[model samples]
Target: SNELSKLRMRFFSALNHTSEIDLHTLFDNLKSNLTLGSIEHLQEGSVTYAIIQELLKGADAQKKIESFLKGAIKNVIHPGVIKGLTPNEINWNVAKAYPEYYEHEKLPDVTFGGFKVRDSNEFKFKTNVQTSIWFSIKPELFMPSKQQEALKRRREQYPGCKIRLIYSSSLLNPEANRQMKAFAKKQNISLIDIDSVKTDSPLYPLIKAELANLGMGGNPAAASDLCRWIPELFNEGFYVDIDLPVDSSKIVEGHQITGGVPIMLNMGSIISEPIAPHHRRQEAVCMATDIIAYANDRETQVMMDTVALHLKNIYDDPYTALKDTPLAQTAFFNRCEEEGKNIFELRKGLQDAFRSDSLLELYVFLGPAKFKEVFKLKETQIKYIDDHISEFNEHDLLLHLISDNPSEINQHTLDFGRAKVMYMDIAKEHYSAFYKPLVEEISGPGAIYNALGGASNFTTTHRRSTGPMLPTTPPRVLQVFCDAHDKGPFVSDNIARWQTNVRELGVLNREGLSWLPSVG
Candidate 1:
């Protein structure tokens, strides 16, 4: 038992090592073959999938793996599973069960994890990995009609994990969020009333103090901005905003990308470069605090809890300072303490905490051919990445939506509806439908598509021939593609409404002019 524990400890150390060299060296020191216990340990911690890839590189790897599995087969509870199966067949079953461990490589999907049961009722079993989804909302917004179904689906989709909602204690009152109790019961979710938390709960005092400092004492509603992260700080889970829609594509992608990372802030959109004829070259600073996930353990707990303790400073410090700094930076500094931390001492040291796995490329790496095949990306999309390869480098930062506030929260700038269909219709539909109203909201009246000085200069005409004025540059269109998918209803609904209003305006604009224009 002690030897097994020691071996497990070494696996843990190597997996968590910050330096790739150190990790590989430590792994190299392991015995030529892994014991059942070690394989089980690595299975539970899938981040070591890379190690498994390395393990298969040896000359005698196939024989060793086959021998290891022959001994490990008894652990699987199968009736007919092993009766007539050949050695290769047994190996294939194990691999199919734990596809995550073997899929990315070109090898057949043989794995050590198995899920076969009685032949009559074969079912895939959930891994023993424990995960949580931390959801929080204001007391007033707990409308069951809009949320219950989504909650139920989330619970079903992510089995073997718990889903907890954080709301105010007042929600239990007769007049306030009373439906929430039933909602919780029906969904089989746990409820955490912010006001009901005990004084001694872990990190409670620290978070409470931070809320008080923000002038929100006894007011859980106002305290939600910081308290939303409480559950995630204590448990390893995803802290998702209750409003963000849940879907399998996003969840699976996030899981694969994170692997065993502690924190990977979700990006909003990409921003355009400053040069004219705009192109999205920089990643935006806006993180979707709404749907960010984390890998929780003591090491990451400190890293996250420090941000909670300084929540007030992150929000209010800028208001009182000589120069306004982004709260995200303040939190970054508080968690990391200026210089970044190395992976080994990650949260333990005072350095900037983003290191190794914590900081990851936004893009997932599949070779160009595979990527093209999988996403079915168009040539236009392919060219966009090629044109801005530096920003879209697979090994570097991942580009999401837009540019600005690289470390602080910024507004989401890319609108899929506009890019996909709106501009093309502007000459026919949106000259008034969407564009006019949007321009009105910003500059108040002078709204020309690609040129300036329409409404601004209509009353005064200047010389037409000059180096700057004679023949102005021809209009250039903005190039972008629809990258976000869940934006369907959100964008389509708004667009449908705008199209109706634009038709109404067209009639209104021509109402009194019919007498002079029609030859008929």
Candidate 2:
């Protein structure tokens, strides 16, 4: 019995060691080292040491060992065999080894009675309405012609979608305010002045009272930022910046699976940007409020209320508020997520929290429940990156337009207009396709467009050697190129030419069709 026990121990050790060898390599070795008929040792290796002990003790050991092997094989093949459960019903403790069952995309098939089951799950529009939040003290100077055309194109994009353009007219003089009102009416755009928003309007007094409490009572620009989050005050449409032209109807229609949550542009980070100067570089992920879409529901309204509350709370806090008095629209999205509010990031990048050091910052603040939610969200974001890895562009600028005081409402209008003109001069085709209509509608073909007419070639537009390429630029507009460094190197050639043009032939204008500094 002692001799048989030693033999069994050696046999068990050999079988245990074989498990470490990769199955593919073992199979390759088996075929090369021996023929299929001479496979007794290979077959015996499959029987573990426990089976040998059982055989050594009893005559019925063969039947019992055979039963044990069958049980083990069954459990391996179907994890829930012992519990009488399906793949979907099994706990992850057992099912984790076979990861396919938990896949959200594949779950639907198994969830509804296997592959052939047909379910009529048609998507119905929750609301066929949208709103555009536009607030500028001097709306005429920010390319109103282009804005008007953009509004018209958006209307055409979503035919039945009722659209509203809310303008902040409190800071504007009587004549200019009257002109904006008339322009809105002329373009067949529904306009509502921010000052005129009624006391009974949804969340009107709530957000207004909070804004005043935060000391933004007289700040119309900051008040305009409130218009973006008013939930029921606006419909289910994108709150777009005047300079960001609407390229697709899907945006206007709000056709996205956001779990019915509002969508904000994921502007990776904003430390170097003009907005939140206090934040360390890549310390936190910032979302651009420029182009956000809402579904106009309780979830969206609740989220807006949370955002409004967070903005007020941050500003109220002496530590986090920092130097900026204007509500940091860029920072609100992250705050909202931290507090467990539902908001979808329209775009994400590796620089965002999940893939970067900022994740530690999030973990330090997120509560246990919020941490779990964010952890799951990280999984989704990782999957999204993996799926679209091939489509990623490294050179893309997160900031659409390098404008000053970007978080503040009206402050960006002038800077953005200059950038738009520079963009038009450098790549007229992109400008014409994406932004020309808005520029034309807001102000009439701006000076740069008229100077080149239809003869400008996008390829040769940036080259000074390609003849008098662009029209004269103003000293103030050209100064933006020298002073502003956030626009990135993508447009360095255009900046050089714009500065040279400003030096050569000066162009200056008070309003319409000029990229000159109209506000400040």
Candidate 3:
């Protein structure tokens, strides 16, 4: 028993050190060498004779025999049976027959660290080597409807891909998990139970304790740990935050080009680059809160609780400020501070604006009227503002039109515009900073294509362009705009919609529209 225990510890230590293992190779080797007939018909007499001969030769072959027996046990359990029982039967019997005392006493709290049984029937017998793709989303970053749409689109694009969602508590209510599970089931995609896994894991508790002591309250260490563990547990997979939704078809294509191995999508650009610093800071705060909330120590918990309340106070005031303001209609930029209602709604609103001209008109029309009513601006004042509208772009219009105080509007426009310019410039700098090094690391453009070719379906217009645009691809190409309020002199979505309309009119091919500089 002592030797067996020692061996088990050594095995786990080796597993921890190795982290990732190629189970496919083991499976392949087993398939190649093992025969069902050999296992079934190995005569006891012949086996005993061989064993006696080995013993006489002083060969320590008992370990080999034990290893063979272990492999045989694994083979028996591999194809849908565990100890001669189906997973469902085992779960039902275990639950029913095992006394509550046994569960309370015998089950090791830290045995599996924090791994929870997500689905006993489905996952209990399934290989632990299975892949999981974890996604972390900010609730205030997207709306529920938009999230649903994104999930639907993702399913349509990648028909067979398995996706497991990990979200902030604020973003996903109890029903959200049920809804997601149902949706995933309908789409033939498995939704791993992330909450259960986190709650049951001692590792999460340990990490929470560490973070609490470090004063890194609200850090998303659990989510980060899960992300880091996926490759270790499943060889290769991806973990992405919900802020970066990709063209699913392109992603799948890229995976195909790279062979069967996993490819992590470059979402760092979307999260750390494109989003505003304030938004990123908000996410960091939320993540920190989550960590602290789950801290093991009482004093640490108290500290985190206080910080959380303070954050709530700060968020609540801004939420109320925006609630009574005209900016609420621009949900993307407006309700970002409201943790529960951000990304999905913004994406939906944008998609609606892109699809219908009327939506944009309605949005803009509502904004101006609210602006006039809230600010007590006269028709003359509004008319004067309209005259100068041509001088100010949409961003300026949004800042000015949303502010109830004209002086505040003026101040914000200047400040926000400068900030916007700085943000965009920083994004450009970061893109080049990563891109140049990555391109060189991969041995230039062709190698990049080779690595990412499987998932490269939606090519940017800049990539296809020639001439003056060759060296400098416009940064704005990465920005996605939904044409919600189309009083358009020219906007990104309006141009795309117009081009789409023209193509439908049989005036030109959709492919030809790709070459048009103005379309971008």
TM-score of each: 0.33, 0.34, 0.23
Q: What is the lDDT of candidate 2?
A: 0.34
How many clashing residue pairs are found in candidate 2? Answer: 8
For the record, the alpha-carbon RMSD of candidate 1 to the native fold, in angstroms, is 25.7
The 10-residue segment of model 3 with minimum total lDDT is 284-293
Regions of candidate 3 where Cα sits further than 4 Å from its true position: 1-143, 167-174, 198-203, 206-226, 229-234, 243-520
lDDT of 1 by residue, 1-520 (tens): 6875666566555345333234444444444444433343334223233334455565565454344333333333122132322122233334445454434222212110011111111211111122222222233546545456666766777654467776654433454466777777877777776656754324455345433432121222224435544543335445554544455433321121211123333322223243334532322211223333344334344444444444333233322221222221233323333443211121112111111122122112222332233234556654565456565432222232223111222232255343322212211221122112211211111111001112211111111221111011111000000011121111111111111222232222432221111111
- Which model scores highest in lDDT? 2
In candidate 2, which residue pairs get closer than 3 Å at backbone N, Cα or C atoms, i.e. clash? 144-442, 145-441, 145-442, 145-443, 146-438, 146-439, 146-441, 146-442
lDDT against true structure, model 3: 0.30
What ranking emerges by TM-score with the best candidate at the front?
2, 1, 3
lDDT tens per residue, model 2, 339-400: 54311120121113222323233233332234333233344544453355355442111122
CA error at residue 165 for candidate 3, angstroms = 2.6
In candidate 3, what are the lDDT values of residues 26-87, reduced to their tens digit?
22344433333222211232221222223333444344433443444344323213222322
State the displacement of the C-alpha of residue 514, model 1, in Å, after optimal TM-score superposition. Answer: 44
Of 1 and 3, the candidate ranking higher by TM-score: 1
Q: On a 0 to 100 scale, what is the lDDT of residue 490 in model 1?
A: 12
